[PDB]
Amino acid sequence: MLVKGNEILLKAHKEGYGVGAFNFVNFEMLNAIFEAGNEENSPLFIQASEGAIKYMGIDMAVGMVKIMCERYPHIPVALHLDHGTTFESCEKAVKAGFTSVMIDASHHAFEENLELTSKVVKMAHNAGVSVEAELGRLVLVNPKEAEQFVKESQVDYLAPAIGTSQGAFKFKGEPKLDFERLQEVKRLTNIPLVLHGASAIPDNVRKSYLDAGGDLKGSKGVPFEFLQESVKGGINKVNTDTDLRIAFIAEVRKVANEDKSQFDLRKFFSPAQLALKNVVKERMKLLGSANKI
Amino acid sequence: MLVKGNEILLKAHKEGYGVGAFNFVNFEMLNAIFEAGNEENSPLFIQASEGAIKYMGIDMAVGMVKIMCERYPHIPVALHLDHGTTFESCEKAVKAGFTSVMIDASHHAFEENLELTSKVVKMAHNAGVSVEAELGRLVLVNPKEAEQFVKESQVDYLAPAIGTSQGAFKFKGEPKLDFERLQEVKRLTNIPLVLHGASAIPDNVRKSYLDAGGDLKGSKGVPFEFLQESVKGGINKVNTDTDLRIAFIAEVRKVANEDKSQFDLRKFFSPAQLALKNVVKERMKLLGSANKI
Ligand SMILES: O=C(COP(=O)(O)O)[C@@H](O)[C@H](O)[C@H](O)COP(=O)(O)O
Ligand SMILES: O=C(COP(=O)(O)O)[C@@H](O)[C@H](O)[C@H](O)COP(=O)(O)O
Numbered sequence: 001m002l003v004k005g006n007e008i009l010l011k012a013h014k015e016g017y018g019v020g021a022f023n024f025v026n027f028e029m030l031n032a033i034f035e036a037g038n039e040e041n042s043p044l045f046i047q048a049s050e051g052a053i054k055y056m057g058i059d060m061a062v063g064m065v066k067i068m069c070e071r072y073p074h075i076p077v078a079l080h081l082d083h084g085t086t087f088e089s090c091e092k093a094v095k096a097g098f099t100s101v102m103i104d105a106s107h108h109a110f111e112e113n114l115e116l117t118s119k120v121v122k123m124a125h126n127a128g129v130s131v132e133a134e135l136g137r138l139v140l141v142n143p144k145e146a147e148q149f150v151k152e153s154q155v156d157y158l159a160p161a162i163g164t165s166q167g168a169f170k171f172k173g174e175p176k177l178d179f180e181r182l183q184e185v186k187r188l189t190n191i192p193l194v195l196h197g198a199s200a201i202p203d204n205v206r207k208s209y210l211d212a213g214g215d216l217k218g219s220k221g222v223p224f225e226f227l228q229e230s231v232k233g234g235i236n237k238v239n240t241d242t243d244l245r246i247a248f249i250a251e252v253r254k255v256a257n258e259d260k261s262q263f264d265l266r267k268f269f270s271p272a273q274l275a276l277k278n279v280v281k282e283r284m285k286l287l288g289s290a291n292k293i
Numbered sequence: 294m295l296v297k298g299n300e301i302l303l304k305a306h307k308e309g310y311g312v313g314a315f316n317f318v319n320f321e322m323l324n325a326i327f328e329a330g331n332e333e334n335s336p337l338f339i340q341a342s343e344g345a346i347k348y349m350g351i352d353m354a355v356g357m358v359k360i361m362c363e364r365y366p367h368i369p370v371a372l373h374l375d376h377g378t379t380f381e382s383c384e385k386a387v388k389a390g391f392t393s394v395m396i397d398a399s400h401h402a403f404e405e406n407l408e409l410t411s412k413v414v415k416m417a418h419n420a421g422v423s424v425e426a427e428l429g430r431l432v433l434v435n436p437k438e439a440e441q442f443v444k445e446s447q448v449d450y451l452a453p454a455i456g457t458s459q460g461a462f463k464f465k466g467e468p469k470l471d472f473e474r475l476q477e478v479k480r481l482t483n484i485p486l487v488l489h490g491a492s493a494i495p496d497n498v499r500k501s502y503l504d505a506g507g508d509l510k511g512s513k514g515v516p517f518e519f520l521q522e523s524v525k526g527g528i529n530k531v532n533t534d535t536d537l538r539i540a541f542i543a544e545v546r547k548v549a550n551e552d553k554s555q556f557d558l559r560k561f562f563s564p565a566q567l568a569l570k571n572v573v574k575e576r577m578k579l580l581g582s583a584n585k586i
């Protein structure tokens with residue numbers, strides 16, 4: 001069922017596994033994510049960015065997820081506002097029915113980040129909603145700051161900057177993350193931690209995309225082994241979007257290329273859903289949330 | 294708000310205009326249709342085929358429409374099962390919350406078509422749901438059969454075969470419809486009538502599809518002038534799907550062609566929604582449902 005984000009992530013925290021947090025922008029993405037969770041017996045974090053909310057309308061974002069939760073009532077599901085940029089945005093999400101909200105104030109100095117995060121936490125906790133915040137920038141997280149930040153804000157989960165970035169072009173050269181910083185943050189905070197920019201761009205997905213005429217010039221994601229290492233270090237929420245988009249659009253491009261007469265939307269989007277679903281299923285197995293319901 | 298189909302079509306029948314009945318398979322199609330109705334101040338028939346229902350799930354088909362109706366509460370909307378093939382399918386749609394259902398038994402002889410239609414009508418009317426049926430095959434409709442069929446079945450609206458067919462390839466030669474049969478059916482039945490296979494393939498939609506590399510070899514739709522003549526002859530519900538698909542997919546193909554690095558779904562589907570919306574807006578103006586709220 002639809003539950004507070006902490007319900008899912010406190011379990012992952014105590015049992016030492018990662019829960020993928022999968023972005024969606026429409027029905028096809030959401031359906032494929034849910035079918036993956038059903039097939040792998042995995043809890044689900046479903047997340048929508050501010051741009052996704054603008055595209056769908058917040059009423060449709062929440063409404064579609066509630067329909068899907070009722071279709072699969074045995075699956076723990078949290079609905080999460082990804083990268084909220086203002087208090088008002090987080091408050092709108094709480095009022096619409098999100099069960100987790102993130103406030104990204106990491107571009108501010110410690111004191112202002114803490115102040116704004118604490119304001120969001122007070123509002124969200126009063127409504128029974130869990131909160132994510134972010135600390136560090138690509139300087140990276142100061143683990144002693146993270147300790148005090150969590151103690152004072154009462155935030156439920158923290159995204160500490162350890163070297164990732166969003167999108168398909170994460171590393172100019174070889175992938176590298178600061179796992180020692182991660183472990184120190186985990187030791188001092190003892191809460192669930194969040195990894196942003198965690199797409200892997202797997203080889204099969206990249207190939208599917210390029211074969212269909214797409215270009216991913218110099219793309220590089222987080223290797224599978226780094227994702228496993230981050231879970232071993234205490235990451236419990238693993239934000240994943242780019243991998244889903246590439247796998248989905250590769251199949252759309254393929255249909256467009258191979259039948260110029262095809263205009264049935266379902267003939268484009270059924271194979272796209274399948275490819276997205278498979279990415280999610282594999283990721284749930286990799287992160288350790290499979291068979292955890 | 295969401296209303297019985299007959300509420301919308303009795304008005305169209307009395308006032309002599311046509312209401313487009315627009316198919317959808319996902320959120321993007323549905324959103325564009327509703328924005329068109331909002332912008333043209335037009336009532337909406339929103340329809341889902343059995344295949345569309347399988348693709349979305351009936352819970353999502355109804356649920357998304359209910360969200361959209363709440364977003365635009367001033368627009369009269371009927372939610373219609375298009376081309377139900379069995380009593381049980383129509384019954385499932387009634388139970389899920391559809392406000393209009395169609396049973397297509399036109400491939401049976403008169404007596405069996407009438408029997409099955411009557412069974413659907415009894416079930417749907419008991420639940421406050423309107424019913425569409427079909428008579429004739431591309432032998433065309435016998436107006437005297439239509440008279441008896443409507444009287445005995447109590448069906449709310451009838452689709453009489455006058456020469457259309459579904460899809461992009463409607464006429465091997467010149468477009469021809471039997472407007473005399475139409476007028477006789479209307480005179481004898483005095484109920485709202487339905488035109489199936491009513492896409493026009495407008496020149497600008499065809500051009501966009503071809504400019505993006507698509508193939509529509511041999512395609513031919515119902516001319517705008519024939520749609521207007523049909524309305525003058527008593528057509529009140531105008532089933533439209535192909536035009537929407539072509540306009541939408543033309544823009545998807547265009548985005549794929551012009552940026553091989555693009556994999557944000559919203560960048561494909563925002564222009565696709567706009568093109569679909571514009572087809573619907575123009576069609577609402579052509580059929581006379583604009584400014585009828
Ligand atoms: O960390 C993220 C995903 O990382 P990724 O790019 O998949 O490695 C998400 O939380 C992003 O913030 C989200 O994908 C941004 O979405 P939009 O703002 O483009 O909708
Ligand atoms: O008459 C119709 C549309 O006509 P069109 O092809 O747009 O001229 C609809 O009622 C069709 O029955 C519907 O488009 C079929 O949809 P699917 O069965 O392919 O979903």
Ligand code: NA
Pocket residue numbers: 047081082083102132239
């Ligand atoms: Na987030």
Ligand code: NA
Pocket residue numbers: 340374375376395425532
């Ligand atoms: Na119909």
Ligand SMILES: [Zn+2]
Pocket residue numbers: 083104106134
């Ligand atoms: Zn950030």
Ligand SMILES: [Zn+2]
Pocket residue numbers: 104134196
């Ligand atoms: Zn971030």
Ligand SMILES: [Zn+2]
Pocket residue numbers: 376397399427
């Ligand atoms: Zn038919």
Ligand SMILES: [Zn+2]
Pocket residue numbers: 397427452489
């Ligand atoms: Zn038909």
